[PDB]
Amino acid sequence: MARTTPIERYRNIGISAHIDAGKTTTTERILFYTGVSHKIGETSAATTAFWSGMSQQFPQHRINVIDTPTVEVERSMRVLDGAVMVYCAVGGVQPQSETVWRQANKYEVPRIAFVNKMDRTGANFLRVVEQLKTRLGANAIPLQLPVGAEENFTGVVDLIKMKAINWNEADQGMTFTYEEVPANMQADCEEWRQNLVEAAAEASEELMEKYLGGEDLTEEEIKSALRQRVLANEIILVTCGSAFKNKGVQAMLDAVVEYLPAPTDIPAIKGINPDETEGERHASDEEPFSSLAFKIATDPFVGNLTFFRVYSGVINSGDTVLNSVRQKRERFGRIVQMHANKREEIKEVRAGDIAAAIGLKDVTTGDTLCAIDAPIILE
Ligand SMILES: [Cl-]
Questions:
Q1: Alpha carbon of 160 to ligand 1 centroid (Å)
Q2: What is the Å distance from ligand 1's center to 124 Cα?
Q3: Residue 221 CA to chain centroid, in angstroms?
Q4: Measured in angstroms, how far is the CA atom of residue 123 from the centroid of ligand 1?
Q5: What's the gap in Å between 173 CA and the centre of ligand 1?
Q6: 1 CA → ligand 1 middle, Å
Q7: Which residues pair with 21 in a beta bridge?
Q8: Residues 6 or more apart in contact with residue 318 via CB below 8 angstroms
Q9: β-bridge mates for residue 354, sequence order
Q10: Is 206 exposed, middle or buried (0-12, 13-18, 19+ CB in 10 A)?
Q11: Which residue in 324, 323, 312, 326 sits closest to 357, CA to CA?
């Protein structure tokens, strides 16, 4: 059997937010747009979905949306590869934001932010951006400026393209048109675009010399540079909008593709070998199989669903593997992946992907399931 989506096109993401930021609505919109990704045009532990861009401008990407509400929150940081930090445009950075931010830094998790609720009374995008800097110590770089705020919120400006995004209300924002930046925003957009170009220029000596030399960096140069810096945990890119009003999540999904890491963009997972020496497993189908079980869900029709993240190699239905923590063998039977509106039966799971096994005999959350001939304990 063959791999259908290249590993570099996977995005394992978790959504982190305070209770009042609109996490449930943001997640529901992500699942809505990524469930109809081929029609887009110019409670599961993990849900499989697809995205090819608001304008079908990217090859198809596989997005795994991982539910991420001490050890549990830290395990989730190892299951996802990148995070989307959701903040309220009114409330901004809360005390609980400071705590989750620290777990994210501990596991060096690249992230972008989505400032939601731009249509609510008291919305102030740049105030939230400034709070990310002053309260969390983040080098927060806006990718956009909102068009209006509160009852006047109508869209967002993509600072790189210098175009306003006008989403179609009738089709729930499945389609949109790019418009000229409004005259009353031109000055602010120029200032904030220069801010993001400066951030891009810091990525390499070649780009810095071009920037200081008076030449304009291209959109491709800017995006590659910003991606490098996000992956290196140097900056957090900021998007905004309203999930409920169908204006913003779509552009944030483009940002997930453009700036968040693939399984191959983060360091190889570390573990302990049988002889007590440290080992590692690279994000490759050719490496020996290794995975971490991260959630056990009950189901009244088939029994326990053991959710696992594969870090290396491949596992097929029928394979017998080792639970290295328990020193017991397990044989995989039925494997499934949850989509937004249905469950899909699959026969194999490869490096960088997530799925759930049915009928495993004795697997605890935190257990490593790996190759018998190449044992390792990841957690
Ligand atoms: Cl309001």
A1: 30
A2: 12
A3: 22
A4: 9
A5: 21
A6: 52
A7: none
A8: 331, 332, 333
A9: 309
A10: exposed
A11: 323
Q: Set out the domains of the chain in order of their start, with CATH numbers.
A: 1-267 (3.40.50.300), 268-379 (2.40.30.10)
Q: How far does the centroid of ligand 1 lie from the alpha carbon of residue 120, in Å?
A: 4
Tell me the CA–centroid distance for residue 93 and ligand 1, in Å.
Answer: 18
Pairing of strands 368-370, 320-323: antiparallel
For ligand 1, the distance from its centroid to the CA atom of residue 152, given in whole angstroms, is 11
In our burial notation (b when 16+ CB lie closer than 10 A, e otherwise), range 70-81 reads: eeeeebbbbbbb
Tokens read off for 112: 């972008």
Phi and psi based region of residue 17 (left: phi greater than 0; alpha: psi -120 to 50; beta: remaining): beta
**Which segments are annotated as binding site?**
17-24, 67-69, 116-119
Please calculate the CA angle 223-229-231 and round it to the nearest 5 degrees: 100
Residue 226 amino acid letter: L
Buried b (16+ CB within 10 A) or exposed e, 45-59: bbbbbbbbbbeeeee
Ligand 1 mean position, distance from CA 117 (Å): 9
d(CA 145, ligand 1 centre) in Å: 19
The DSSP result for 208-262, as a single string, is HHHHHTTPPPPHHHHHHHHHHHHHTTS-EEEEE-BTTTTBSHHHHHHHHHHHSPP
- DSSP H stretches of helix in 80-185: 95-106, 125-136
Residues counted in the chain: 379
Å from CA of 61 to ligand 1 middle: 35
Task: With CA atoms as reference, report the closest residue to 164 among 150, 145, 184.
Answer: 145
DSSP states of 300-360: TTT--EEEEEEEESEEETT-EEEETTTTEEEE---EEEE-SS-EEEESEEETT-EEEEES-
| 308: CB partners within 8 A, 6+ apart | 291, 292, 293, 294, 349, 354, 355, 356, 357, 369
CA distances 12 to 189, 205, 308, Å, are 31, 31, 12
Annotated binding-site positions for GTP: 17-24, 67-69, 116-119
Cβ atoms of residues 279 and 272 within 8 Å? yes
User: What CA–CA distance (Å, rounded) separates 320 from 296?
Assistant: 20
